[PDB]
């Protein structure tokens, strides 16, 4: 189109054509906007587009054209500035400075093109970052002088100082070398008194102008770093705390200024500075009460209405009070004349904590935690805040949010459904409220109980019954478990549950019953101490959980099984013994009616039920009773199991029935569930099924392969094959579960592993990729982890079966087979730690693929893969060095030392792997340290390339100097020399070594970096 013309630099640039491309891009739409987009991108990245920028700024009619012209300059200044001749350097400075002055002197331009002024100022500051003070010593004096001659210029100079402070103190850590940031910080520090005085004068001689706001905005930045004397030993605190609080458009920035003030570096042994810290607080609270709102005001509603800036202001007020009071409240708690100030400030926070906005509430709750922890440990303080804490309990109790245990939830329509997702943010909010509430109960357990019982009273008689109110109250009652005495707890709990049982029988409909059931279950689950001492109530609880397992509403039954587990892991002892006045241990009554009570549960609920039963049974430590309790629990699963394997091993084609495959899977899932809670104790049941289970694995394997061969790869997606692969994954998971928790490791080696490896390794290696289960890798990881030291040859066999063929699946992109990818490097990690000898038994060609496999893991951005990849590399280097001066280690270094050095350099420096920076550095440092401690006993170089007497230190720095020179051709030789020098001297100090590396990452993004930076 006509718009492509601006990318042809053969001609003069048509400014009108540019402005239209720009206009099309910003104000147009559709494919013209999209065509314009790519044209300006090509225009902007053209390496000589900066030469036009002078031209555009003069004659363009379009602000955003000029913005883009500056962006092009910006990228010139920040990256290739130092190669320009100085004719162009000073010229660019001159027309950037002149454009700023020219725009400030025209008042309608100053009013209307704020974006373009702001971008020019940022571009000036990028010029300052490379030229000032060494090639511009006059800048700050001239800036100060120019301020007095024009007010628009004065205001704009505050924006330039603000941005300069930001770039030097707030964002320099990542973007400059240590030595340059140190140089620019010292330069500002020496010139700040000239700057502070100009800022102080502006603030005294002016009220609420836009010049005032711009100055306060720059002061906020200076407060991050300036010496305390500029704030405490001038009058600036009084101005901030009174004059700039009354005017509403300086008020927001002042309040952020005083928040940063409530964080300075300040002596603690000076009572005048303490007086000033009190006074600016007293002045600010004074100005809020008379100019903004009184202590009594309903901030909940103010915040809800969202008039003007009320939301931002209430946020900034919350941040001010909690910052100031977390550090200085003790300055208020002794003097009786400041008691009113102290409590008025907290009263404002009480009103802030009523605002219905979660992030604001998290801000105040963190402060309340800070306060009530202090009142609980600090002597003689809690009485000061008695009334504050009493209202704080009400706030927390009425705004409890749902704990993780509660699975029923109100939706948008207003019915009670089971929760779809885990809400991790609200789970965390619940624990934060619990921790504050727990402290507040300890500070006055009578008040807390009174609030709660009288709230419960008003739920029974209905005068404020609601789903919200019964929930929040129930959750608060549950969260304070352990704060009461055993006697007060017993009266409290008996009351609360008897009443909650009352509500459940009273109310109509399955929604009201689902709500009250989830509340009952939350409470009971939180008080096992009470349940353990009162078998009467424990057993009614358990039986009541069994009733809830029969409810239509699936959310209620799920929570019953989880509450049953929660009670049983704390009360299991009381189920396993026979109580007074009963026939049997309750476990055998539970196992007895296990089919009836689980009748309307879905499969995974019943599997949870059996896991709870498993938790109980493992409390019994006599082997004979536990082995048979186990046998009785597994009777339904074993009964069904025996009929299935007698059918299948008789006729191997009866299994294809899809309802048989679900029967088989739920049988195995029941075993997995039970083995999860019993661990080592599971072993008798496992043996009862182990050999038949491995035969059903081989049988199911053949059918998977037969169906892929008959129907194609798509067969892996069908329900029938997915169901049979479920059977293999559940079999592997049961065995992985037992082996991870097993005590008797010789039984593992002598009985379990050889049948396992024969059943699964060949079947994995010889299936097509889309048929191999990543779960096999996972299962082998646990086998090597627990018993690897006892089975060297089995680890060899594992390597050979899975290693090359799985490497072939995952080594052509970073995407395919994502769970194979993760289980594979997990498996190589554990083999390399616990059975490194296995890698020694690999042929040289397979050891090369191993090394290839590691460096492949570095380049991932799936952090499960790369942390294991970098870990394996570090562990392999450790393994080679323990061997010492032997042929395999010396060969390894000659074949792989420089492959490892360059591969970690590549990922350190390519800006695509910055999350592994720390482990990359550690690996690189360990590699460099080997050479500098002479731990490599043969020459790394091939012979007749360097003289024979030369050390590996000498050749390493040539190798790296050459490798860096070609990869980073724009670095000078001195830059590379000084870097490697510093890098090798620092190769035992990880933190400095890492700073050298980050300094290098800065310099490769620019031209002309100073080599002396590496002596920092």
């Amino acid at each position: 189109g006509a718009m492509e013309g601006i990318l042809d630099f053969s001609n003069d640039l048509d400014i009108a054509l540019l402005d239209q491309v720009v206009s099309t891009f910003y104000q147009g739409s559709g494919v013209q906007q999209k065509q314009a987009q790519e044209i300006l991108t090509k225009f902007q990245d053209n390496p000589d587009a900066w030469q036009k920028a002078d031209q555009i700024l003069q004659f363009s009619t379009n602000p955003q054209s000029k913005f883009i012209a500056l962006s092009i300059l910006d990228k010139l200044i920040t990256r290739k500035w130092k190669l320009l001749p100085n004719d162009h350097r000073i010229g660019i400075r001159n027309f950037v400075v002149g454009m700023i002055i020219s725009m400030c002197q025209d008042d309608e331009v100053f009013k209307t093109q704020k974006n373009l002024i702001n971008k020019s100022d940022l571009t000036l500051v990028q010029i300052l970052k490379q030229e000032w003070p060494q090639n511009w010593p006059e800048f700050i004096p001239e800036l100060i002088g120019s301020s007095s001659s024009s007010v628009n210029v004065c205001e704009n100079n505050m924006i330039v100082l603000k941005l300069l402070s930001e770039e030097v103190f707030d964002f320099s850590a990542e973007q400059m070398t240590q030595a340059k940031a140190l140089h620019l910080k010292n330069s500002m520090s020496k010139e700040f008194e000239q700057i502070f005085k100009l800022c102080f004068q502006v603030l005294e001689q002016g009220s609420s102008s836009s010049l005032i706001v711009a100055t306060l905005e720059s002061l906020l930045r200076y407060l991050h770093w300036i010496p305390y004397r500029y704030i405490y030993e001038t009058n600036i605190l009084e101005l901030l705390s009174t004059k700039f609080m009354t005017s509403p458009d300086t008020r927001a920035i002042t309040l952020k200024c005083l928040t940063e003030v409530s964080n300075l570096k300040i002596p603690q042994d000076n009572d005048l500075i303490k007086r000033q810290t009190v006074l600016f607080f007293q002045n600010t609270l004074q100005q809020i009460a008379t100019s903004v709102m009184p202590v009594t005001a309903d901030l909940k509603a103010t915040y809800a209405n969202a008039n003007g800036n009320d939301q931002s202001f209430l946020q900034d007020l919350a941040m001010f009070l909690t910052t100031y009071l977390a550090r200085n409240r003790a300055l208020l708690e002794s003097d009786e004349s400041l008691r009113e100030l102290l409590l008025n400030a907290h009263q404002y926070l009480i009103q802030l904590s009523k605002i219905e906005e979660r992030e604001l509430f998290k801000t105040t709750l963190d402060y309340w935690h800070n306060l009530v922890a202090d009142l609980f440990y600090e002597p003689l303080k809690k009485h000061i805040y008695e009334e504050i804490c009493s209202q704080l309990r009400l706030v927390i109790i009425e705004n409890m949010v749902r704990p993780e245990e509660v699975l029923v939830v109100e939706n948008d329509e207003g019915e009670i459904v089971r929760e779809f997702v885990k809400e991790s943010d609200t789970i965390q909010l619940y624990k934060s409220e619990r921790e504050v509430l727990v402290y507040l109960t300890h500070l006055n357990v009578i008040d807390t109980e009174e609030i709660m019982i009288s709230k419960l009273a008003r739920q029974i008689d209905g005068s404020e019954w609601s789903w919200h109110n019964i929930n929040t109250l129930s959750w608060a009652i549950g969260s304070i478990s352990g704060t009461m005495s055993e006697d007060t707890e017993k009266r409290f709990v008996v009351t609360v549950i008897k009443d909650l049982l009352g509500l459940c029988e009273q109310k109509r409909g399955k929604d009201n019953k689902a709500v009250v059931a989830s509340d009952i279950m939350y409470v009971v689950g939180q008080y096992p101490r009470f349940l353990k001492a009162h078998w009467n109530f424990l057993r009614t609880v358990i039986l009541k959980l069994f009733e809830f397992m029969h409810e239509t509403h699936e959310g209620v039954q799920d929570m019953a099984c989880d509450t049953f587990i929660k009670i049983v892991q704390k009360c299991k002892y009381h189920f396993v013994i026979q109580q007074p006045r009963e026939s049997e241990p309750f476990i055998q009554t539970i196992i007895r009616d296990i089919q009836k009570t689980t009748a309307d549960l879905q499969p995974q609920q019943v599997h949870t039920f059996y896991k709870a039963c498993g938790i109980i049974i493992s409390e019994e430590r006599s082997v004979a009773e536990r082995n048979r309790l186990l046998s009785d629990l597994m009777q339904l699963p074993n009964m069904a199991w025996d009929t299935i394997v007698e059918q299948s091993t008789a006729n191997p084609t009866l299994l294809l029935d899809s309802e048989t495959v679900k029967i088989i899977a739920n049988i195995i899932k029941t075993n997995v569930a039970v083995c999860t809670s019993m661990g080592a104790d599971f072993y008798p049941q496992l043996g009862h099924i182990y050999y038949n289970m491995l035969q059903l694995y081989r049988a199911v394997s053949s059918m998977i392969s037969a169906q892929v061969a008959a129907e194609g790869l798509i067969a892996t997606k069908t329900p029938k094959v997915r169901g049979l692969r479920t059977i293999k994954k559940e079999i592997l998971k049961l065995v992985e579960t037992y082996i991870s928790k097993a005590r008797n490791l010789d039984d593992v080696v002598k009985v379990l592993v050889e049948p396992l490896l024969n059943a699964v390794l060949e079947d994995y290696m010889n299936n097509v990729p889309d048929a191999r289960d990543a779960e096999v890798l996972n299962c082998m990881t646990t086998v090597v982890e627990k018993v690897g030291h006892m089975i060297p040859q089995g680890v060899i066999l594992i390597l050979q079966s899975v290693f090359e063929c799985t490497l072939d699946m995952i080594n052509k992109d970073f995407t395919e087979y994502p769970e194979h990818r993760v289980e594979f490097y997990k498996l190589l990690k554990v083999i390399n730690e616990k059975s490194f000898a296995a890698f020694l038994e690999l042929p040289p060609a397979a050891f090369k693929l191993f090394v290839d496999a590691i460096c492949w893991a570095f380049k991932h951005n799936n952090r499960d893969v790369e942390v294991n990849g970098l870990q394996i590399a570090l562990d392999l280097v450790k393994n080679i060095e323990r061997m010492g001066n032997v042929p395999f280690a010396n060969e390894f270094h000659k074949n792989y030392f420089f492959i490892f050095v360059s591969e970690t350099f590549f990922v350190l420096t390519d800006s695509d792997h910055k999350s592994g920076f720390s482990k990359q550095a550690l690996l690189l440092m360990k590699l460099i340290s080997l050479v500098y401690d002479n731990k490599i006993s043969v020459p790394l170089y091939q012979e007749a390339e360097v003289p024979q007497g030369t050390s590996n230190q000498v050749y390493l720095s040539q190798y790296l100097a050459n490798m860096l020179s070609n990869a980073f051709p724009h670095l000078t030789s001195e830059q590379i020399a000084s870097f490697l020098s510093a890098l090798t001297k620092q190769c035992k100090d990880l933190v400095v070594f890492k700073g050298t590396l980050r300094d290098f990452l800065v310099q490769i993004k620019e031209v002309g970096g100073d080599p002396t930076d590496y002596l920092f």
Binding site: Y26, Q37, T41, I68, K119, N305, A306, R863, D864
Partner: protein, 209 residues
Amino acid sequence: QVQFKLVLVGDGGTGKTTFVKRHLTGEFEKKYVATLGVEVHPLVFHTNRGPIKFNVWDTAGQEKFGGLRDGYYIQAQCAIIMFDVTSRVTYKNVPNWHRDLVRVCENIPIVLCGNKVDIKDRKVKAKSIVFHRKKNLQYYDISAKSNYNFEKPFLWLARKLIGDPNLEFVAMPAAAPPEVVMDPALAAQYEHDLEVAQTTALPDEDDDL
């Protein structure tokens, strides 16, 4: 109808394009195709105060693909800053995105969004996220995959852009749809694709729905 320019910024891979595409078409793109510069997308929501349109400027997070960078922010009326709760580094550069953003847009509503909260191994946990408190950003955990809180950024911006705190999304009315006849000249084209559709498996077959 009135429309507002929205800029969506954040590190590469955090899910900005996935989040936009989930709102445009309903889909969940699993692949990562880094965007180059910006791509502009109209997106309209129906409220009890009429329809609100966002021209969503979906910017590139990778530096090599950055395009015009802060040039995309000019005359933005609102913004979303995106990071990934499974990647600490993307929370570490949130102050860098916010820096570049507010130097160009001095006073606009801005949402901070930590995406991917559906992944079990969360690395930036909900206690560590506090950057929004002093910058007056609204913060939300979201998951473009599970759609957790996926409408709240837009509903918050709509409330502040219109200036009505009680603004709610409402059911757009559904016109009575037609009765069109099939034709045998274009059918054998559709019936090959109907066949291919039956033999192409549905994604995520172990999901609850």
